[model samples]
Target: ACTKNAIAQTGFNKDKYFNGDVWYVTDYLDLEPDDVPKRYCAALAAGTASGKLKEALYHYDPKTQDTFYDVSELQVESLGKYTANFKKVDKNGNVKVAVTAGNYYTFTVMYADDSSALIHTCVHKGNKDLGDVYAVLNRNKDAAAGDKVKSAVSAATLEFSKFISTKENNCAYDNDSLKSLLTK
Candidate 1:
């Protein structure tokens, strides 16, 4: 289950990434109860090594009037021999976007190429905080030193697509364009 408030205190700049740009809602998953669902979305406007990764998440409430939101930008803080240290930062501020990291979050890359790349991100936060995140971030291009800033983008988009297709009254903001991308 995607912990709703695990990173809620972290704030982001919605306009910076989503401002008049073609942000894509990609993936979704229902929480434990199967009644509440989560949405993941992304905008291809930031960079790490090769490209940028921006992710937004929200727990959709059909009856709520207030807008609910959460977002994070994955940044390469430093690189090591086999592991890269990364910080998930809020889009709007200096507050480090903290995930469920135990001591730290380090990632590695596999199946990488010029036009595309794959990264495996492991979340090590305590069990009390949340479970691990088995995430595969697929980018459309080569990332700097295989530092995948765009890795989380694919996860968000994929989850958002699933949410939109399964939930009633829950559809893509630009339904047609998003569906084409998802199907292709």
Candidate 2:
């Protein structure tokens, strides 16, 4: 169903999204949309009209996975700090994160949760420790236990995914073959 409304006074509204060609969470991934579920819904409000999606605030189930893959679609401009929460869980459980512009990471909104994520480590120029930190984030984004670095990576991944799912209009609508309509 098509929707047009904001969530709790936040700038997120369905009206702003209807203008583009969008693929459903299930249709984009070619997964059974009905099989997947929506864990929760939230909004990511950015700084200004030129700003990109500042936060990855929503979470879903199988649908959430689709959101993670839609990152390139949202392409937020210049967003600041953002918060993500679930409708079912306690509001206190919401995850808050922030990022500076022109960094290694890109800004955008997403449908993310704790399960799916992508962690990118930013290394300063001419810093010897850059290699070490990069290795750490890569390891965590791929395989890591419950550690601070891993947690950070996980948060970033979930947030990025949220930005993708909500912002992306043309995404691959299948699971086995992850091919997208838009050129990469």
Candidate 3:
């Protein structure tokens, strides 16, 4: 299903999620894509008309053993049915991640309730870490653990397995050995 409308007025909407605002990529499900074959995931964020996706947002590259603040572009095309195609348009220069622009990425929009939403991106179709994905969310610190957000996160984990077989997912570790320092 190819949908053009927003997922919700204040939750899970493509435009609000990626087009022109700030968001926190709280977690990610690292795995390969069903449509395309690859080995990594391209982590990114954006919020502008100039398509300026290069902003140093907090992201940890397990491969690099260091946390970084960088930028990249991701155009999320709504494919409907709680699914959307996440396309990497441009690098916007600055960055640190596991995937690249050519990799295939898609996400299932899952909502915990009315105020919080989980945007789960599927990649390994060619993915990275310190918490997996990245974010520039300038909200209350406790919001991450809020009941609404927790529910959304829980839903995302279930949705992550829906696109691909669990056997294909690497739930253990990322590319960086330093990630081992972060506990299993």
Q: Rank the candidates by TM-score, best first.
A: 3, 1, 2
For each candidate in the order shown, give its overall lDDT on alpha carbons: 0.31, 0.24, 0.33
For each candidate, give its TM-score against the true structure: 0.31, 0.19, 0.40
What TM-score would you give candidate 3 relative to the actual structure? Answer: 0.40
Off by over 4 Å in 3: 1-11, 27-44, 51-58, 61-76, 79-102, 112-116, 124-142, 153-184
Tell me how far the alpha carbon of residue 94 in candidate 3 is from the true structure, in angstroms, after superposition: 5.4
Point to the candidate with the largest lDDT: 3
lDDT tens per residue, model 3, 6-117: 2322344444544433333433343333432222222233334454322223333334434333333334354322222222222233222433444433334545332344
State the lDDT of candidate 2 residue by residue for 30-111, as single tens digits: 0123422323222221121223321222223434443322111234232311222212111232212223232233222222
Please report, as a residue range, the 10-residue window in candidate 3 with the lowest summed lDDT. 129-138
Say which prediction, candidate 2 or candidate 3, comes out ahead on TM-score: 3
**Candidate 3 Cα deviation (angstroms), residue 78:** 2.1
**What's the number of clashes in each of the models?**
18, 19, 13
The TM-score leader among the candidates is 3
